Structures are given as C-alpha cells and as structure tokens.
C-alpha cells in the first residue's frame, strides 16, 4: 500500500508522495493511472519527494501533470513540499535546501507553519522585462485602445505590468487584460495585474497571466504588484496580498535586496493506494 497525502497551495490541489522511504517508480503510465479520479487518486498535480542528488541538499522533488509529463515551473509546489517533509518526519529543519527541475531553493518554514520563498531581486530595467521604453520610471503612460492608463513595469524572471484599480470586482479584467498583455511595447507579452490598494500593508489583486488569462493564484504577480507599489512609494516593506485563490504575504526592503514571498499549505488528507 503506497501512502500519499493530498495538499493545497496556490489554489492548486497536490497529490504528495514520500518516495524517500517508499520504493516507487513514477512511469508516465502509472502517473496517468493515478490522475484518474475513479481508477486512481485524482489530482491537479503530483508532487514526488525524492532523496537529493547533491550531498549538500536535503531533498529533490518533481512535479508531474495528469498527462504523465514532468512540469518545470519555478517555485511550483514549494510550500506543500516544505510542510510535507516536516509533517511526515522526513526532516526537522526549518531552512530546507531542495533541488527541483528549475534549480535549487532554500525554503523557510516560519513558526506559523507558513513557507517563505526567496524570489530574488526585482528588475525594473525595461531592457530586461522586456519593455519598449527609453529608460526606467516609477510610472509609465500607455495608450490602450481608446484609453490612456498609468502603470509600473517590472520583471521577476517574467514580465509584469501593474496598474492600480480602486476595486478589483469593479475591474475591467476581460476587456483590459488582453489589450495590454499583447501590447506592442511588450515584445514577449506580459502578465498584467490589477492592484486595489486597501492599505500600505494590504492589497487585493487579480492577474491576467501572460498566456492563460485569470488564474485564481499567480505567485509572481503578487510579487510584482508589491515590488512596484514599493518602488512607486505607495506601500510598506511588508504587504498582505489577497487573490481569488487565497492570501500571500510579500516582503522586500527595496533595490539591493531580495524579495520574499510567504504562503500557506493545507494538509487536507492522507491515503493509501495499491499499485
């Protein structure tokens, strides 16, 4: 009986498997069988915890989708991994060093059982977003269709354009999102975020992702909207962010420092399945 847990993070449902103390090989055929909600377990994504490849790291973990393919999205599933290895007694560390398909990270489990990720230092140089603009500013003007708007632009690995709305339920997400996502001044498109500032330390936000549109949880967008609000002088050094998928908490001391993202992971169930 192979044991597993179901967990939830970033509005995403994970099947999580300890393949450190269990001998399991995840062929694509087994993965698709496990993704079947009636023959197997059913999951959005499968998180497999493995022994490390490097003697200096604690674990390696992989993420597979329902088709049986390995998925390499940076930071994906990090919060549920860190809590899972602690919940299951695979480690007692609070700073867990782990390798993924996108490299290695150091994950910190805070004493409130939240997981903090170092997302690096945001980059506002329009050359590296990439953005058609002569030099970096705290705000840019862009004529979008029959409407002139203001925005900040930053890259966190991926391009981001953030604009301030005064409520996100009253936001023109479906009419405005696509127009600036594929705007001529974004040669590689960009994730557009609609940021309703409730307080210098509190924000609501919806995000029109680059290729997908509105996902209920996009971590890089929350990082971007807080990075710009700080650089624009509108926000405190530590901001709460509320998205349709849940709440994140960003922290960043400004240029020269790395930005930190902290989020929850919910342990919803444990289970058995005979393979």
């Amino acid at each position: 009986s192979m044991q597993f847990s179901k967990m939830h993070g970033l509005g995403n449902d994970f099947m999580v498997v300890d393949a450190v103390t269990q001998n399991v090989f995840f062929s694509p055929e087994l993965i698709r069988r496990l993704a079947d909600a009636h023959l197997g377990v059913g999951f959005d994504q499968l998180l497999v915890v493995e022994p490390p490849y490097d003697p200096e790291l604690d674990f390696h973990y992989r993420i597979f989708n329902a088709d049986g393919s390995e998925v390499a999205q940076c930071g994906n599933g990090a919060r549920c991994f860190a809590r899972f290895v602690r919940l299951k007694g695979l480690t007692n560390k609070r700073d867990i060093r782990v390798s993924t398909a996108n490299g290695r990270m150091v994950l910190t489990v805070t004493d409130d059982d939240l997981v903090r990720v170092n997302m690096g230092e945001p980059n506002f140089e329009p050359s590296a977003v990439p953005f058609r603009a002569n030099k970096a500013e705290k705000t840019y003007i862009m004529r979008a269709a029959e409407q002139t708007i203001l925005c900040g632009v930053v890259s966190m690995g991926n391009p981001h354009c953030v604009i301030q709305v005064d409520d996100v339920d009253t936001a023109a997400v479906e009419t405005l999102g696509p127009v600036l996502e594929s705007h001529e001044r974004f040669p590689e498109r960009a994730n557009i975020g609609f940021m309703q500032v409730v307080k210098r330390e509190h924000i609501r936000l919806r995000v029109y992702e680059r290729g997908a549109g509105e996902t209920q949880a996009c971590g890089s967008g929350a990082c971007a909207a807080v990075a710009v609000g700080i650089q624009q002088g509108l926000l405190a050094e530590e901001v709460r962010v509320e998205l349709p998928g849940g709440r994140l908490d960003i922290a960043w001391k400004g240029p020269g420092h790395p930005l930190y993202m902290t989020g929850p992971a919910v342990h919803v169930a444990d289970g058995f399945i005979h393979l």
Binding site: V20, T21, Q22, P51, D58, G89, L90, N92
Partner: protein, 160 residues
C-alpha cells in the same frame, strides 16, 4: 564459516551521524563507490563487538569516540547480484544479513582515521545529508538502506 544454511553471512552496518544531522559516507579502497561502513561478524563475537572492532579498524574510532543511539531490532538481508556470487567457494555466500547501528560521533572530526588498518577497505570519507545515501548506494543495497534510514530518522531528527 559463519554463513548460515540460506547462504547469508552475518554482518554489521554502521551509520555515523554528527550533531548537525549529517551522516558519514565512506569511499571503498581503489574504487568509485561509496557506502556506509559494514563488516562481517567473526566467530565468538556478538554484533556490538563486531561493530566496535570494525569501527576502529576501518574508521579509526574508539568506544569513547561515539555513542550508540539506536540499532535495528532484527536482521536485514540483501542478496548479492548473481554476477558477484563466487560459486566455487564453499559454503557459498549468496548474500549478507545485517544488523545496523546508529552512532553519534562524540569526538571531533580529527579522531577519524581510515588508515589504522594494514588492509583498509576505505580510503576516504565525507559528511552527507541524511537521505543522500538512499539514492547513491549501489542498487542491490538500496532496499536495506531505505529501511535502515527510515527506522533511524526519528532518532536523528529529534537531535539539534
């Protein structure tokens, strides 16, 4: 010989941890492969006596250099891959049967010496993360290693 009637030679294995939760990883002499120290039990000695003997001769550590934290209750067995069984040597040994010890290195790293023996089975060592040996051990020992490191995890995790 000590080979039982199944073909398993009695054996002792050693997991040496430091106060940071790392475990000692040893390279076999004149080879590429790494492993935990292990050795055969000799006639007349118990498992613990064979452990202390193999500990000193292969790692150079005394009884006072370490502390016993745990040991596996019964035998763990692995079969040699039939490529490696010396069939002409009787009684034929088709595998090893092991009792495992978890030690905490009480002294400093400078008390390890892998050359106290004329016939060293190991020529090097390093600290590795706790679960690293489960991936890196040779394949036919992996099931034993996974069971051992799983049994010992709670003891090591409940230190600092």
């Amino acid at each position: 010989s000590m080979i039982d009637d199944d073909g398993y030679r009695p054996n002792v294995g050693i997991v040496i941890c430091n106060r940071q939760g790392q475990v000692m990883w040893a390279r076999r002499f004149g080879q590429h492969s790494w492993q935990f120290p292990q050795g055969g039990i000799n006639p007349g000695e118990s498992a613990e006596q064979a452990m202390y003997r193999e500990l000193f001769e292969e790692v150079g550590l005394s009884r006072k250099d370490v502390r016993i934290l745990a040991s596996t209750r019964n035998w763990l067995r692995y079969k040699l891959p039939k490529r490696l069984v010396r069939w002409d040597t009787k009684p034929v040994c088709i595998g090893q049967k092991q009792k495992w010890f978890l030690l905490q290195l009480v002294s400093g790293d400078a008390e390890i010496n892998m050359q106290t023996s004329s016939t060293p089975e190991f020529d090097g060592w390093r600290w590795v993360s706790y679960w690293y040996p489960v991936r890196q051990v040779v394949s036919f020992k992996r099931d034993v290693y996974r069971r051992v490191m799983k049994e010992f995890a709670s003891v090591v995790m409940s230190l600092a």
